Design a protein around this ligand. Structure first.
Ligand SMILES: N#C/C(=C\c1ccsc1)C(N)=O
Lengths: 300, 237
């Protein structure tokens, strides 16, 4: 069990750690988060009390280094930092655990929610979507735009998700126009799975990461990307049976975890009604269709 | 974006554009089967692709053989239309290719857009106008060539005859749409108006009668009357 310690909490902020969150008061004696489960990526995120504008945060994996947070009063945010000195950082942390100044990652033993939301998400792929190669962890916020968004403006601060476009030469074989537009299996299986992602785990990882950025940061381009990757599967007549079964589980847990009061902005009516009721896979997402119908029957 | 009454003069500027109407591509007669069920029998159709500035009509005849063994024909018809429009553009010299294609039905937008991906600089546009191009098969010579075709065929017409020698494009298009609106609202009477007499004939190389300027004013007046009436006869007013 690993620890994301803090230098101090100089400004009042709501701190999120994965799907949990807690309020810290200005200058409250707070020195971090302990008992973080090893084996999963994590995200630690922030919303200042003064400026609910800009949710921001950091994706990280404690196996990859020792990470600590210090508030920067010039740039005005809580920054993640890595410490090479394994011995100095530990002595500072034990000291703090002794004084009980850390909150405990509050995982219920029965609960597999985080695993289920991050099953295929790996840090190495996060770091290729979020390009900042000098750090082991990745910053994301509400305002960052995607590569595809910048084609329709700072390339350094973009989310380099895989571009999906249903009316594009990549998506449509010359002479198969109607066939490929109405049945996207070619584009799913050959172009994206075999060609770009290599396997369905990497596809699902990007899909899960897009959802999490949409949910935790209100990142609109991430939300677009999540829906596009869902729609590409649902609009394919030919999908491996194991991918459909896993997609149903993935979406079920995303829909289960979504805040009930964010469903209006985070869910695209057209995509979901097409996917659950009109598409090739309308009958293949039993768990997802059942939770959607009992929790968000208005959208549909 | 979409084409409407506010930007109507844009049709007659010097950017090449084509209207594409697909309403006559997939045409059927509905009949009873011996078992008392209902069946369709397709008849020959056509794509109506029209330059509104020059009057040039590219009439692609759709022979019923193209439907053989195919499913969901109304959906295929839109994609067949887009394939043939795309083939037509590619056959034109670059300096003849359109800069915009306006589809009369919004369901043509995605099929044409996908077929024209090679042409990113050709704008595909809908329209809010209710253009009467479905009535093109009420033009006798157009109907005749469609129904006689035994194979896929493209036939080229000028739907304005020689009108541009005496009137502007805007005026010729207004005349065309008035003629077609009349034919669409009451074909018999529209056709009675146009050729019930002897001395105002159709040249072998024309579609419409050889009317003098004054005779066109009477004709146009009679078509307006028909259209207003049918609109009463329909709503009782
Ligand atoms: N180690 C360390 C450092 C700061 C800490 C470490 C955990 S909380 C605050 C540092 N090198 O500045």
């Amino acid at each position: 069990m690993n620890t994301v310690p803090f230098t101090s909490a100089p400004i009042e902020v709501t701190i999120g750690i994965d799907q949990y969150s807690f309020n810290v008061k200005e200058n409250q004696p707070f020195h971090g988060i302990k008992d973080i489960p090893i084996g999963h990526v994590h995200v630690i995120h922030f919303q200042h009390a003064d400026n609910s504008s800009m949710r921001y945060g950091y994706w990280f994996d404690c196996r990859m280094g020792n990470f600590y947070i210090q508030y920067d009063p010039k740039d005005g945010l809580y920054k993640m930092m890595e410490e090479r000195d394994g011995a100095k950082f530990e002595n500072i942390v034990h000291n703090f655990k002794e004084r009980q100044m850390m909150v405990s990652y509050p995982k219920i033993d029965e609960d597999d929610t985080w695993y289920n939301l991050t099953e295929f998400v790996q840090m190495d792929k996060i770091r290729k979507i979020v390009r900042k190669d000098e750090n082991q962890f990745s910053y994301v916020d509400s305002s960052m735009t995607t590569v595809q968004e910048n084609e329709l403006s700072d390339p350094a601060h973009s989310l380099n998700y895989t571009v999906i476009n249903f009316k594009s030469r990549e998506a449509i074989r010359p002479g198969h126009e109607m066939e490929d537009f109405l049945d996207k299996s070619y584009y799913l299986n050959t172009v994206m799975l075999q060609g770009i992602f290599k396997n369905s785990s990497n596809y699902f990882g990007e899909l899960q990461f897009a959802f999490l950025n949409a949910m935790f940061f209100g990142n609109y381009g991430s939300s677009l990307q999540w829906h596009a990757m869902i729609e590409l599967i649902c609009s394919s007549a030919t999908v491996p049976k194991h991918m459909l079964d896993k997609l149903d589980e993935i979406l079920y847990y995303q829909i289960k975890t979504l805040p009930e009061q964010y469903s209006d902005i985070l869910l695209n009516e057209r995509v979901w009604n097409i996917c659950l009721y009109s598409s090739f896979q309308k009958n293949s997402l039993h768990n997802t269709e059942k939770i959607m119908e009992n929790k968000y029957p208005e959208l549909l | 974006g979409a084409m409407n009454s506010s930007n109507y003069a844009e049709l007659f500027n010097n950017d090449i554009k084509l209207f594409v109407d697909d309403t006559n591509v997939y045409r059927v007669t509905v009949h009873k089967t011996f078992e008392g069920n209902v069946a369709t029998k397709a008849i020959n159709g056509c794509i109506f692709t029209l330059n509104p500035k020059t009057g040039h009509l590219f009439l692609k005849i759709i022979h019923t053989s193209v439907w053989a063994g195919q499913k969901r024909l109304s959906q295929l018809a839109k994609w067949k239309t887009a394939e043939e429009v795309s083939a037509l553009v590619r056959s034109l010299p670059k300096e003849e290719q359109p800069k915009q294609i306006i589809v009369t039905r919004k369901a043509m937008l995605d099929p044409l857009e996908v077929h024209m991906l090679d042409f990113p600089n050709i704008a595909i546009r809908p329209t809010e106008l209710r253009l009467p191009f479905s009535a093109a098969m009420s033009i006798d010579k157009l109907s005749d060539v469609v129904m006689k075709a035994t194979e896929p065929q493209m036939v080229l017409f000028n739907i304005y005859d020689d009108w541009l020698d005496r009137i502007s494009s805007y005026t010729a298009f207004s005349r065309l749409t008035l003629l077609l609106r009349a034919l669409k609202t009451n074909e018999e009477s529209a056709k009675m108006i146009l050729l019930s007499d002897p001395t105002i004939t159709i040249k072998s190389y024309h579609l419409w009668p050889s009317f003098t300027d004054e005779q066109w004013i009477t004709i146009e007046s009679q078509m307006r009357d028909l259209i207003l009436t049918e609109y009463g006869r329909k709503y009782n007013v």
